[PDB]
């Protein structure tokens, strides 16, 4: 029922890592290919996701213990969860009043129809929006928000992971910090921690649905050429 110095240091370093890799001004968005409203939004949203993958990579390397892993394990965890971290971190721009992602002006405001113009269907987008609303209604502290992202990235049960025991120990170290934070900051505690873990289960099925739809898009040359090299590396099937 109290945080040790190193538990607090893990929290401090994770929120600082998030502040350095998430620019609330979204001023870099003007360098993306312009939004346009056959898949007129795919160029802009591909640049958005590709840019966000860079930010996720930057955040990952500031997670205590992550850089101590093998380069292969670092990439295996990043490839398997990048889309989940993006969906998690996107909740900061999601607004329940408009049910949209607002990153500044209306040009960079993304509703669900904009994503239909990137090659995705409601079998993914409607569960994604429902996930965003449920995540928004939990009203997480930013400390709980960044701990959840770190916990999602350090999941040992990802394909291609070799040093499993090392990754699970770091994940448990973060879950213990998160559980203690909730217990101190909130009445009770076990209920909220349970739903945060459930949100990670929701992200697994969202990933599954996105990977299916991405594979269909990436195998059509007219759409695949609108992607970016980093997106093809990260979301692709290569090894």
């Amino acid at each position: 029922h109290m945080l040790s110095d190193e538990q607090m240091q893990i929290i401090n370093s994770l929120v600082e890592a998030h502040h350095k890799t998430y620019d609330d001004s979204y001023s870099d968005f003007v360098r993306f290919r312009p939004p346009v409203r056959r898949l007129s939004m795919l160029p802009h949203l591909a640049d958005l996701v590709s840019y966000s993958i860079q930010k996720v990579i930057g955040f990952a390397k500031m997670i205590p213990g992550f850089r101590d892993l093998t380069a292969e394990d670092q990439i295996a965890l990043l490839k398997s969860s990048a889309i989940e971290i993006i969906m998690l971190r996107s909740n900061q721009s999601f607004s329940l009043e408009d049910m949209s992602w607002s990153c500044g002006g209306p040009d960079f405001k993304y509703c669900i129809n904009d994503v239909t113009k990137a090659g995705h269907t409601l079998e993914l987008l409607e569960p994604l929006v429902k996930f965003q609303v449920g995540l928004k209604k939990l009203k997480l502290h930013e400390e709980e928000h960044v701990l959840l992202m770190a916990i999602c990235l350090l999941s040992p049960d990802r394909p291609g992971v070799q040093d499993h025991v090392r990754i699970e120990a770091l994940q448990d170290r973060l879950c213990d910090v998160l559980q203690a934070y909730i217990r101190i900051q909130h009445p009770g505690g076990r209920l909220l921690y349970a739903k945060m873990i459930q949100k990670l289960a929701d992200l697994r099925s969202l990933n599954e649905e996105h990977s299916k739809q991405y594979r269909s898009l990436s195998f059509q040359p007219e759409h695949s050429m609108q992607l970016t090299p980093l997106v093809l590396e990260v979301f692709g099937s290569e090894v």
């Binding site: 860079q54 380069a71 292969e72 670092q74 990439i75 990043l78 490839k79 090299p229 980093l230 093809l232 590396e233 990260v234 692709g236 290569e238 090894v239």
Partner: peptide
């Protein structure tokens, strides 16, 4: 391809 993913130094 993991040519770019080799900026994991």
């Amino acid at each position: 391809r993991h040519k770019i993913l080799x900026x994991x130094q």
